[PDB]
């Protein structure tokens, strides 16, 4: 090969930057919603947020390169900004700072969120500054050898792109649960958020220097003109004035003679129709970003895939980037078999409303999954009504009579799952063969669950659950039981579970998830039997129930009895949703870009890229109003409403594509 590896550089620049923007994103979303956790409709509201505000940086980093600086310098300083940012964020996510003074100033609202704020907004000005120079400038490098050279270069350059992003998301995933082998942090996302950092470090030290070779592009799309004419006619048709010429014909025309008169205006109107085009796409790109978002947090709460291997809460974009890889090359060549033996041609537009079509699909099978979740969740009821439940730890079998119904508890045996009652309608009696039936007496308080602990006909006790919140942002719990005559002490992962009252349960603390031993210490029980055993399978924001009775001997033994199951689904349906958004995105995309690109002259590819990019940012704000603003219902509310948004929007564009003149070899 020559000296000359400007390839490879380019390449491993791309590479970096891509790899690093995915990350950032998955990792964001999963930590906004775990770590801080304002809240669900927040968390997705402030991603979105960062979307729009990268996605509308461009511009004003074009106009920037255009104004003073120079496009060598414009990217190096953003480059540099986007790597501060991402290092201060990660700074901002570890929480220890060694000062050899003692006070600590957090100025007022918490330095955490506010760092957090500061390097996002300033990897938003960095991205959005990056992404757009590198294409453009390796296109403008040497396009005269189109032959082989330049097909080299899209072809690596597109193996590129699709690598650091599959890459990224994995491995941001993987990084982020780790308990770091260092002084005691069982943190998550210091590692993870600082990993892409170095690669940003690295691709500046790649392009550190152009190798003495390299082109000056200062003019950029000419900004003045772009401002200009909408002040002008505005200005000159608003004041008070006869305008007895054209309404709005004259005034164009008029100050187009008074600024640039030439193709530039002529090419102004011709873009002003193409992109009124775009107008309506908006729906289409909001609801990609909204699914990134709102698919990371309903896959927080499905089932894992535990199977052979975990598949971990933000790796379902990985699906995306897969499939997006593999059917690229297939949707070429299968999917358009021309006429083949039919009797249909398939043209962009009709091409774009079957992408909007197909994204309407993907979004209501993710209803449809998303109302499957349902079928198993944890209920808690509100106020004025008590969730009991019956467990045995005596010797013997009792009959226990609830209202209008009694069944059987055997030993070591609990009842059916939790069964609601009214508070003014409750009335327990406990009662065993030959046994005085022997009612209870106790103030249930009101929108909580109570277990029901029995060893004797006569002798009962209440004890609160006290999760009435689910699991919070936590993963799995777990209790103790007592059922000896004496308190014990247990210690498990490292935590200590002290003075386990007899005949009474342990309070609830969260674990990590994984087999847990544990070691249960009294005077009960002697040193000969091994007081170390180890749980069986734990899922993901399960609770359970451990009950240590006597065993022949005497000896403690396990006793499993689940009150909040773990949740089952299988990720299986986050690939359907996937394959059709997935299809969706390709088709759309592709389509627009090329059949935009077609209608319009090769000066202003920078125009379209613009209002391409300006339609994808307003619908990250369309998502903001919606998801920030509108709480009512669940996932499955604001799904089916998207659903129908974007049914309406490509009957909208079906009908618009019906009444459209084209153009023909622009002259």
Same mark, same amino acid.
């Given at each position: 090969?020559?000296?000359?590896?400007?390839?490879?550089?380019?390449?491993?620049?791309?590479?970096?930057?891509?790899?690093?923007?995915?990350?950032?994103?998955?990792?964001?979303? +999963?930590?906004?919603? +775990?770590?801080?956790?304002?809240?669900?409709?927040?968390?997705?509201?402030?991603?979105?947020?960062?979307?729009?505000?990268?996605?509308?940086?461009?511009?004003?980093?074009? %106009?920037?390169?255009?104004?003073?600086?120079?496009?060598?310098?414009?990217?190096?300083?953003?480059?540099?900004?986007?790597?501060?940012?991402?290092?201060?964020?990660?700074?901002?996510?570890?929480?220890?700072? &060694?000062?050899?003074?003692?006070?600590?100033? @957090?100025?007022?609202?918490?330095?955490?969120?506010?760092?957090?704020?500061?390097?996002?907004?300033?990897?938003?000005?960095?991205?959005?500054?990056?992404? @757009?120079?590198?294409?453009?400038?390796?296109?403008?490098?040497?396009?005269?050898?189109?032959?082989?050279?330049? #097909?080299?270069?899209?072809?690596?350059?597109?193996?590129?792109?699709?690598?650091?992003?599959?890459?990224?998301?994995?491995?941001?995933?993987?990084?982020?649960?780790?308990?770091?082998?260092?002084?005691?942090?069982?943190?998550?996302?210091?590692?993870?958020?600082?990993?892409?950092?170095?690669?940003?470090?690295?691709?500046?030290?790649?392009?550190?220097?152009?190798?003495?070779?390299?082109?000056?592009?200062?003019?950029?799309?000419?900004?003045?003109?772009?401002?200009?004419?909408?002040?002008?006619?505005?200005?000159?048709?608003?004041?008070?004035?006869?305008?007895?010429?054209?309404?709005?014909?004259?005034?164009? +025309?008029?100050?187009?003679?008074?600024?640039?008169?030439?193709?530039?205006?002529?090419?102004?109107?011709?873009? &002003?129709? =193409?992109?009124?085009?775009?107008?309506?796409? @908006?729906?289409?790109?909001?609801? *990609?970003?909204?699914?990134?978002?709102?698919?990371?947090?309903?896959?927080?709460?499905?089932?894992?895939?535990?199977?052979?291997?975990?598949?971990?809460?933000?790796?379902?974009?990985?699906?995306?980037?897969?499939?997006?890889?593999?059917?690229?090359?297939?949707?070429?060549?299968?999917?358009?078999?021309?006429?083949?033996?039919?009797? %249909?041609?398939?043209?962009?537009?009709?091409?774009?409303?079957?992408?909007? *079509?197909?994204?309407?699909?993907? $979004?209501?099978?993710?209803?449809?999954?998303?109302?499957?979740?349902?079928?198993?969740?944890?209920?808690?009821? /509100?106020?004025?009504?008590?969730?009991? !439940?019956? +467990? /045995?730890?005596?010797? #013997?079998?009792?009959?226990?009579?609830?209202?209008?119904?009694?069944?059987?508890?055997?030993?070591?045996?609990?009842?059916?799952? $939790?069964?609601?009652?009214?508070?003014?309608?409750?009335?327990?009696?406990?009662?065993?063969?030959?046994?005085?039936?022997?009612?209870?007496?106790?103030?249930?308080?009101?929108?909580?669950?109570?277990?029901?602990?029995?060893?004797?006909?006569?002798?009962?006790?209440?004890?609160?659950?006290?999760?009435?919140?689910?699991?919070?942002?936590?993963? /799995?719990?777990?209790?103790?039981?007592?059922?000896?005559? !004496?308190?014990?002490?247990?210690?498990?992962?490292?935590?200590?579970?002290?003075?386990?009252?007899?005949?009474?349960?342990?309070?609830?603390?969260?674990?990590?998830?994984?087999?847990?031993?544990?070691?249960?210490?009294?005077?009960?029980?002697?040193?000969?039997?091994?007081?170390?055993?180890?749980?069986?399978?734990?899922?993901?924001?399960?609770?359970?129930?451990?009950?240590?009775?006597?065993?022949?001997?005497?000896?403690?033994?396990?006793?499993?009895?689940?009150?909040?199951? @773990?949740?089952?689904?299988?990720?299986?349906?986050?690939?359907?949703?996937?394959?059709?958004?997935?299809?969706?995105?390709? =088709?759309?995309?592709?389509?627009?870009?090329?059949?935009?690109?077609?209608?319009?002259?090769?000066?202003?590819?920078?125009?379209?890229?613009?209002?391409?990019?300006?339609?994808?940012?307003?619908?990250?704000?369309?998502? %903001?109003?919606?998801?920030?603003?509108?709480?009512?219902?669940?996932?499955?509310?604001?799904?089916?409403?998207?659903?129908?948004?974007?049914?309406?929007?490509?009957?909208?564009?079906?009908?618009?594509?019906?009444?459209?003149?084209? =153009?023909?070899?622009?002259?």
């Amino acid at each position: 090969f020559g000296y000359p590896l400007s390839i490879f550089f380019i390449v491993v620049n791309e590479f970096c930057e891509r790899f690093s923007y995915y990350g950032m994103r998955a990792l964001l979303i +999963l930590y906004f919603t +775990l770590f801080i956790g304002w809240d669900d409709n927040l968390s997705t509201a402030i991603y979105h947020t960062f979307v729009a505000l990268c996605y509308l940086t461009p511009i004003l980093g074009a %106009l920037i390169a255009d104004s003073w600086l120079g496009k060598f310098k414009t990217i190096v300083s953003l480059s540099i900004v986007y790597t501060i940012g991402q290092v201060v964020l990660a700074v901002s996510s570890i929480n220890d700072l &060694t000062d050899g003074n003692r006070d600590g100033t @957090p100025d007022s609202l918490p330095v955490h969120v506010a760092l957090s704020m500061i390097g996002l907004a300033l990897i938003a000005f960095g991205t959005g500054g990056i992404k @757009p120079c590198v294409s453009a400038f390796g296109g403008d490098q040497f396009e005269e050898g189109q032959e082989k050279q330049r #097909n080299r270069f899209f072809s690596i350059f597109y193996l590129a792109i699709n690598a650091g992003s599959l890459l990224s998301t994995i491995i941001t995933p993987i990084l982020r649960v780790q308990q770091c082998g260092i002084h005691s942090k069982q943190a998550c996302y210091p590692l993870a958020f600082g990993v892409p950092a170095a690669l940003m470090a690295v691709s500046l030290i790649v392009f550190v220097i152009g190798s003495r070779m390299y082109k000056k592009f200062q003019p950029q799309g000419n900004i003045m003109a772009k401002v200009a004419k909408c002040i002008g006619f505005a200005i000159t048709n608003r004041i008070r004035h006869r305008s007895n010429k054209f309404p709005k014909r004259e005034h164009w +025309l008029d100050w187009a003679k008074e600024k640039y008169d030439e193709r530039l205006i002529s090419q102004i109107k011709m873009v &002003t129709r =193409v992109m009124f085009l775009y107008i309506p796409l @908006p729906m289409f790109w909001a609801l *990609f970003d909204q699914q990134g978002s709102r698919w990371t947090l309903q896959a927080t709460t499905m089932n894992g895939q535990i199977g052979v291997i975990e598949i971990q809460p933000d790796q379902m974009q990985t699906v995306n980037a897969i499939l997006i890889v593999i059917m690229v090359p297939i949707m070429d060549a299968v999917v358009y078999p021309l006429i083949a033996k039919c009797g %249909l041609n398939f043209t962009s537009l009709k091409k774009m409303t079957v992408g909007m *079509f197909l994204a309407s699909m993907a $979004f209501v099978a993710a209803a449809i999954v998303q109302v499957e979740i349902d079928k198993t969740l944890p209920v808690f009821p /509100n106020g004025h009504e008590v969730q009991v !439940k019956v +467990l /045995n730890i005596g010797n #013997n079998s009792m009959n226990i009579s609830f209202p209008g119904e009694t069944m059987a508890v055997n030993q070591m045996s609990q009842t059916g799952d $939790f069964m609601t009652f009214d508070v003014d309608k409750l009335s327990i009696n406990i009662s065993s063969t030959g046994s005085p039936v022997t009612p209870v007496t106790h103030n249930f308080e009101q929108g909580h669950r109570h277990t029901i602990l029995v060893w004797a006909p006569n002798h009962y006790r209440v004890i609160k659950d006290g999760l009435d919140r689910k699991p919070e942002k936590g993963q /799995n719990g777990i209790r103790f039981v007592n059922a000896f005559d !004496k308190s014990f002490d247990v210690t498990m992962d490292g935590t200590v579970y002290v003075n386990v009252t007899s005949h009474s349960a342990s309070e609830y603390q969260f674990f990590p998830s994984g087999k847990k031993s544990f070691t249960i210490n009294s005077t009960e029980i002697s040193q000969q039997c091994e007081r170390n055993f180890t749980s069986p399978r734990l899922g993901f924001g399960s609770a359970y129930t451990y009950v240590m009775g006597r065993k022949a001997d005497g000896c403690p033994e396990l006793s499993v009895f689940g009150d909040i199951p @773990p949740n089952t689904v299988n990720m299986a349906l986050q690939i359907p949703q996937y394959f059709l958004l997935t299809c969706g995105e390709v =088709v759309f995309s592709v389509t627009g870009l090329e059949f935009s690109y077609s209608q319009a002259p090769s000066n202003m590819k920078s125009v379209l890229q613009a209002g391409w990019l300006l339609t994808v940012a307003v619908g990250n704000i369309i998502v %903001l109003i919606v998801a920030g603003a509108g709480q009512f219902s669940k996932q499955w509310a604001e799904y089916i409403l998207f659903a129908a948004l974007l049914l309406v929007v490509c009957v909208i564009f079906g009908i618009m594509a019906q009444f459209y003149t084209y =153009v023909n070899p622009a002259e």
